[PDB]
């Protein structure tokens, strides 16, 4: 098809990351609003950007949730890596959660350059590595802005969601190093 | 992991690979250029301090050129990229040497061999310092001798 | 540190070293095998993205064959730095931030000899704004790989 030096033919291959589902999580995006992280063939996590909120109380009962060991430990591990990877997070009010009955659900209020919405969107940009630019509108520029007001993270069941981008573990594996690399004093 | 940042080549250079430091990157000096044969070692070795500085200077150059300047100097970018540019354990090595009264590298001055007629130079090694004063040439003479021999071996490897 | 995981050899191979990707590891493609001379570069270099993927695929293969658990996330969290170069994907993240063509780890390209059947190590097919680059935009990369193929074929 395309020959170089008359003897070397240019050939390609595309990896199907879906087969890594049993060992590592996989990030992907459905459309502009919805993005997903898949753990195995059953459980998962849905990162959705919406102008509509889902939690109105500004409390996060993590200690209660830990004691009542109902939630999936895997999903809790990736929801911790996300919140820790946020840089310069200083407005705990925007962080509101609801872990009643193991159902994990976390909401980040982006309405509250340098603001708390940048750091949460920077970490979201890394997390869903494929197809995150579609929701960002940012381009190249540090400072990230979006029309949407809330980033809602909910537990969900596995389906054929990865429509815009293929699944990949590259996003999650990168946040692991930059986990507690940027946090203020408590 | 280890550094993956590759040094960017300017548009007018004759051989793809060399790197140059402007007169504003060097104190009390004009611009200095280093050949591809020397800079190539920066991609192989993990222990060279002058290489870690080149990636810092290049990253700073690339970030200013390609990224619209922040309002008030956001530091988040370098906090992400540090391990992709420098060897953290290399500067920890110099911190160990300073603690043990050993001459260490404070990343300011470097020395190299320049052939008087061909113009090729070795990769700049760090000029060590002990108690607020750089070492005399007399105290690392045998480090310079070894570098000349490697220069000879590298020059003969072309012919 | 750096990655220490060595790729495991299958039993029906002619030379100890090569690695093969099954038809279920590749999308819309049959199985592809790569020779010892190419995969040997995975142990030397630190900068190759396709090597990082082979170590991930191999680790997933070895972990399924030898253990039983899907909270297996605890295992990869320990092993990540022994399989991949963390800063290599940070490099791609930096390139994406600077409007530079980056590698999203999906498509790769390689040169395949017409009669020898020998192949280069697959390099990553870069992408910029949701579309892979044309062959025309990295043709001098392919030219350089073809030159390395000839000098390797002579040895």
């Amino acid at each position: 098809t395309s020959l170089y030096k008359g003897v070397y033919e240019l050939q390609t291959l595309e990896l199907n990351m879906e087969t890594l589902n049993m060992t590592m999580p996989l990030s992907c995006t459905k459309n502009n609003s919805h993005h997903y992280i898949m753990v195995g063939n059953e459980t998962g996590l849905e990162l959705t950007l919406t102008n509509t909120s889902i939690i109105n109380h500004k409390f996060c009962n993590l200690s209660d949730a830990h004691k009542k060991n109902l939630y999936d430990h895997a999903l809790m591990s990736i929801i911790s890596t996300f919140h820790l990877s946020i840089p310069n997070f200083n407005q705990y009010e925007a962080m509101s959660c609801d872990f009643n009955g193991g159902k994990i659900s976390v909401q980040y209020n982006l309405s509250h350059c340098g603001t708390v919405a940048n750091g949460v969107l920077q970490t979201f940009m890394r997390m869903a590595w494929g197809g995150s630019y579609i929701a960002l509108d940012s381009g190249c520029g540090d400072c990230i802005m979006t029309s949407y007001q809330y980033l809602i993270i909910q537990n969900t069941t596995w389906e054929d969601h990865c429509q815009f981008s293929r699944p990949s573990p590259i996003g999650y594996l990168g946040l692991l190093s930059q986990r507690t690399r940027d946090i203020y004093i408590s | 992991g280890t550094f993956t940042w590759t040094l960017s080549d300017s548009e007018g250079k004759d051989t793809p690979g060399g790197y140059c430091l402007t007169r504003w990157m060097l104190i009390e000096a004009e611009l200095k250029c280093f050949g591809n044969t020397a800079v190539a070692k920066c991609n192989e070795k993990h222990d060279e301090e002058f290489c870690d500085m080149l990636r810092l200077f290049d990253f700073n150059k690339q970030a200013i050129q390609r990224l619209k300047a922040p309002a008030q100097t956001s530091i988040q970018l370098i906090n992400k990229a540090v391990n992709a540019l420098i060897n953290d354990q290399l500067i920890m090595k110099n911190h160990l040497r300073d603690i043990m009264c050993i001459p260490y590298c404070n990343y300011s001055k470097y020395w190299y061999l320049n052939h008087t007629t061909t113009g090729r130079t070795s990769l700049p090694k760090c000029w060590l310092v002990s108690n607020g004063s750089y070492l005399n040439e007399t105290h690392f003479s045998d480090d310079i001798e070894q570098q000349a021999d490697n220069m000879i071996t590298e020059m003969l490897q072309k012919e | 540190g750096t990655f220490t995981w060595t790729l495991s050899d299958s039993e029906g191979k002619d030379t100890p070293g090569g690695y093969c990707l099954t038809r279920w590891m590749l999308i819309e493609a049959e199985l592809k095998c790569f020779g010892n001379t190419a995969v040997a570069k995975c142990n030397e270099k630190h900068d190759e993205e396709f090597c990082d993927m082979l170590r991930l695929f191999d680790f997933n293969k070895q972990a399924i064959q030898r253990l039983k658990a899907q909270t297996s996330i605890q295992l990869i969290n320990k092993a990540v730095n022994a399989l991949i170069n963390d800063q290599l994907i940070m490099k791609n993240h930096l390139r994406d931030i600077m409007c530079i063509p980056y590698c999203n780890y999906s498509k790769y390209w390689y040169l395949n000899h017409t009669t020898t059947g020998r192949t280069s190590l697959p390099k990553c097919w870069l992408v910029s704004n949701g579309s892979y680059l044309n062959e025309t935009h990295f043709s001098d990369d392919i030219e350089q790989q073809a030159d390395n193929m000839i000098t390797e074929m002579l040895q």
Partner: antibody
Amino acid sequence: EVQLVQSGGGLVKAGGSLRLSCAASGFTFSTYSMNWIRQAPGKGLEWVASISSRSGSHINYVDSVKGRFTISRDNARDLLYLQMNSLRVDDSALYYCARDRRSGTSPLPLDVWGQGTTVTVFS
Amino acid sequence: QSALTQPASVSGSPGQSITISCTGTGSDIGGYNFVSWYQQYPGKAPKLIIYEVRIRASGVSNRFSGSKSGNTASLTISGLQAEDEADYYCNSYSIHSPWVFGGGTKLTVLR
């Protein structure tokens, strides 16, 4: 100073043929891809042809030039050629040769240009 | 196959700031960040001033600045000087060809 020295313009009858030369000076010519750009009298620049580094395995032309012009390179003598055949009147312009690098990791723009050589096709 | 839309001419008093447009489609300027700008004096070869949208070439004054928004790239010149009066061309990577040039712009430093 990195430069390119062109040669071989002149006058040619419509339908004739011409050969354009471009000689590299002071740079490892073999590692760069070479381009041809023409500029009509009192008009803008227009890219014409391209050839990849080392073996010229990757070659591109403009649709209004396909099957009539042929780009080539001799890495031994550090030369770039452009063989024009069945020359139209429109082809008459000032022709430049320029070097670049089609790389994903370290690309280069059209940094080095030739001095330019004139081609005039009369009917 | 078509060219890139540039203004025929832009003019400005000395010391003033002026901008040169360069409009294309998603196939060229919108699809790559490889826009370059060239300065051509009469009877001379084009001189590369800016490449990769924003980066200046060696020796190019900081008065020259390159930008891009969507399908349009812009070359801005502050502190207009007589030496700047020349023809300015833009070019970009393309899905269909390695390069595609603009029509060109005659910058005039009004006297």
